[PDB]
Amino acid sequence: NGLRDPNTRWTFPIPYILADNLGLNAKGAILYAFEMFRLKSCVDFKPYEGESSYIIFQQFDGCWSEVGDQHVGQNISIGQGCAYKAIIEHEILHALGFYHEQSRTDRDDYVNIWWDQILSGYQHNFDTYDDSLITDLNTPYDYESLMHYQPFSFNKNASVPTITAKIPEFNSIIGQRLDFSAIDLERLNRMYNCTTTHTLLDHCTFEKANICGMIQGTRDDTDWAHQDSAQAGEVDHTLLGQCTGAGYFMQFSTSSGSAEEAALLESRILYPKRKQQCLQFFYKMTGSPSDRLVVWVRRDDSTGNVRKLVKVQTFQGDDDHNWKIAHVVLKEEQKFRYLFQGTKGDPQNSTGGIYLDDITLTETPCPTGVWTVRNFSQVLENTSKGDKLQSPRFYNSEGYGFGVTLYPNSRESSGYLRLAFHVCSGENDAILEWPVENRQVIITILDQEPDVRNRMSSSMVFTTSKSHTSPAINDTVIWDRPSRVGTYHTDCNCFRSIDLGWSGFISHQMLKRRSFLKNDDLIIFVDFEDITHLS
Ligand SMILES: *[C@@H]1O[C@H](CO[C@@H]2O[C@@H](C)[C@@H](O)[C@@H](O)[C@@H]2O)[C@@H](O[C@@H]2O[C@H](CO)[C@@H](O[C@@H]3O[C@H](CO)[C@@H](O)[C@H](O)[C@@H]3O)[C@H](O)[C@H]2NC(C)=O)[C@H](O)[C@H]1NC(C)=O
Ligand SMILES: *[C@@H]1O[C@H](CO)[C@@H](O[C@@H]2O[C@H](CO)[C@@H](O[C@@H]3O[C@H](CO)[C@@H](O)[C@H](O)[C@@H]3O)[C@H](O)[C@H]2NC(C)=O)[C@H](O)[C@H]1NC(C)=O
Ligand SMILES: *[C@@H]1O[C@H](CO)[C@@H](O[C@@H]2O[C@H](CO)[C@@H](O[C@@H]3O[C@H](CO)[C@@H](O)[C@H](O)[C@@H]3O)[C@H](O)[C@H]2NC(C)=O)[C@H](O)[C@H]1NC(C)=O
Ligand SMILES: *[C@@H]1O[C@H](CO)[C@@H](O[C@@H]2O[C@H](CO)[C@@H](O)[C@H](O)[C@H]2NC(C)=O)[C@H](O)[C@H]1NC(C)=O
Ligand SMILES: *[C@@H]1O[C@H](CO)[C@@H](O[C@@H]2O[C@H](CO)[C@@H](O)[C@H](O)[C@H]2NC(C)=O)[C@H](O)[C@H]1NC(C)=O
Ligand SMILES: *[C@@H]1O[C@H](CO)[C@@H](O)[C@H](O)[C@H]1NC(C)=O
Ligand SMILES: [Ca+2]
Ligand SMILES: [Ca+2]
Ligand SMILES: [Zn+2]
Numbered sequence: 001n002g003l004r005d006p007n008t009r010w011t012f013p014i015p016y017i018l019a020d021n022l023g024l025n026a027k028g029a030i031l032y033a034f035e036m037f038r039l040k041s042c043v044d045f046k047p048y049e050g051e052s053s054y055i056i057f058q059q060f061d062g063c064w065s066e067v068g069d070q071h072v073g074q075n076i077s078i079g080q081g082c083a084y085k086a087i088i089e090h091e092i093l094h095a096l097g098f099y100h101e102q103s104r105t106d107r108d109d110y111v112n113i114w115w116d117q118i119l120s121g122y123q124h125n126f127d128t129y130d131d132s133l134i135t136d137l138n139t140p141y142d143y144e145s146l147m148h149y150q151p152f153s154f155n156k157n158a159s160v161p162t163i164t165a166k167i168p169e170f171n172s173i174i175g176q177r178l179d180f181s182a183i184d185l186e187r188l189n190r191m192y193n194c195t196t197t198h199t200l201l202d203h204c205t206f207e208k209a210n211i212c213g214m215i216q217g218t219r220d221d222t223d224w225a226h227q228d229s230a231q232a233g234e235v236d237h238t239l240l241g242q243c244t245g246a247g248y249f250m251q252f253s254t255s256s257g258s259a260e261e262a263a264l265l266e267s268r269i270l271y272p273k274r275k276q277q278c279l280q281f282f283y284k285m286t287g288s289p290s291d292r293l294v295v296w297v298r299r300d301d302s303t304g305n306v307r308k309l310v311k312v313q314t315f316q317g318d319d320d321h322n323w324k325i326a327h328v329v330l331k332e333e334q335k336f337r338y339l340f341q342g343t344k345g346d347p348q349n350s351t352g353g354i355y356l357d358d359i360t361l362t363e364t365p366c367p368t369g370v371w372t373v374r375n376f377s378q379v380l381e382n383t384s385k386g387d388k389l390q391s392p393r394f395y396n397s398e399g400y401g402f403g404v405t406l407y408p409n410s411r412e413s414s415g416y417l418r419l420a421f422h423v424c425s426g427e428n429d430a431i432l433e434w435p436v437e438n439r440q441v442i443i444t445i446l447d448q449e450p451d452v453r454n455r456m457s458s459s460m461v462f463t464t465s466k467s468h469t470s471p472a473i474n475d476t477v478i479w480d481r482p483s484r485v486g487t488y489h490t491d492c493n494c495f496r497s498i499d500l501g502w503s504g505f506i507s508h509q510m511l512k513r514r515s516f517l518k519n520d521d522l523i524i525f526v527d528f529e530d531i532t533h534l535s
Pocket of ligand 9: 091100
């Protein structure tokens, strides 16, 4: 589906204008989509500064783009309801040079188009092009492609589909609005010569005996064991016992020796391109409650030698023995190495140890709040329609309190989750401005893969607004101070606002695909941050 003529190719970074007929929500959503491109490809974007061809993003009727670089500068429309990651990425892929997936020359081998069902004026989105105009980039037809239409697209009748897969199973798969497919990234890389990406700095799964180039220190007392996943119940996080003799984690036993013994596992040297990074990993602590996992940085002391230590975070064992996710913010502006110190406490009271797998390091912020729901595949069966779960309270950088509500069986839409955001009372409320006004919420359901290029995390975006009001609170703003417009909960001593979000956030069948439920538990990320400065 890529335009063949090389004079249609951009030279990076692509200069952009965000126009003031966009709302703040749309500007923030576009900048969030540019971060996803920089994180999964070598595509890059810059503010305009006066250049020959450029993309101007505007609000007109519907979502659309011209295809490929137009040398006089071009327009990308993001209308009402278009301001979602997957939709912005679809229009930017048009500007980069891609037509819809159903427009491939071979498409009649894979899908049926029902022409008399298409609403007038939209039919060109179902055209197919000759191989003189379009390349396949030597890739097969991808039903999972972000560039493929859903069955009920531009249909005259709500019951009859416009496009259907010839093999009938894929009717449930085509038209996904998660993220780029693997084949979409391969096509993008083949078109633009991307061998790397601007923002994935390191990742590790411990699956090769090289342990991702990690080294073990000798100023410590002991070593981490590279561990085989063969022993009963000792499964690795990357594969959870799926493949025999082939899943690997790092282990530090705490059941023997002296208290306060330690082991250092230390990364290879890294060269950061930005001022901030996020280190994500999975761990367990089945040992003593006094065992510790500590994360450290070792960095250039400005002589060019990596020696200076900084302690960044500490983790400890609660009563939960299943795998946990962790995020650590790093602020490294010179070359460095990230380090794990495992430490024993009370070895005569430990029958276990510390475990590590699935490290990822990105030159991004960390998620502001993270919620894990355990046994979700069982929660989904044991919960009536309109029953709910609620997250613990999180806090912004700005100090606002917030949380999320999950209704596992949406009474508003059967066969979907309903996931929604609320503002919580917190210790800061007296000094914060109310209503919260132009703060953008991003909710993400993590696709649990260690390489970010394999992740199709579902995500939704909205901006808190003075127009968000409810009859339940005498038609006042939902985002006013939670002590006057929320309801008290004994679960955290919080007042929680009325919630706003999506019935139909994700379907139960989509949630059982990919790695959304990897260990039969569900990981939701949330961010809540000011975007007023984009005005
Ligand atoms: C010695 O170890 C015990 C038990 O620890 C358990 O068994 C070990 C072999 C390991 O497998 C451990 O991972 C495992 O937890 C310690 O008992 C623990 O003590 C803490 C503190 O009292 C308990 O936490 C409390 O839990 C209650 C609710 O039950 C809360 O209300 C409290 O606020 C607090 O969180 C923990 O439940 C308890 N664990 C168990 C399963 O008994 C013991 O303290 C430890 N002693 C020493 C000297 O370190
Ligand atoms: C992005 O889209 C907008 C809207 O399509 C483009 O602005 C448009 O520019 C054209 C060409 O100048 C305008 O056409 C002219 O309109 C005047 C009357 O306004 C008429 O006298 C001329 O004969 C001609 O038809 C068009 O009206 C104008 N639309 C608006 C609303 O301003 C814009 O150029 C596009 N930008 C890029 C870089 O693609
Ligand atoms: C991505 O990498 C490929 C492979 O290096 C680039 O394709 C190559 O592009 C150059 C021009 O930069 C081509 O050279 C030109 O060839 C034409 C005749 O085909 C000639 O008329 C020109 O004077 C010039 O010599 C080269 O042939 C071409 N090779 C292939 C395999 O197509 C491609 O441009 C890169 N794309 C980018 C910039 O992302
Ligand atoms: C939209 O499509 C549905 C399904 O084809 C149509 O409903 C059928 O209409 C025929 C003729 O009236 C009935 O014999 C069937 O029993 C109907 N089936 C269902 C599922 O109701 C519907 O009429 C179409 N609507 C439009 C706008 O033509
Ligand atoms: C999720 O469900 C599993 C399976 O029911 C729970 O694991 C069992 O937990 C009970 C009570 O601790 C034990 O007696 C069983 O032996 C466990 N079975 C297995 C397969 O391990 C698990 O505890 C549940 N987790 C949560 C957090 O609810
Ligand atoms: C809304 O109005 C009713 C009737 O005046 C009153 O009883 C109730 O307390 C009001 N609630 C709020 C949110 O002020
Ligand atoms: Ca050592
Ligand atoms: Ca592993
Ligand atoms: Zn499109």
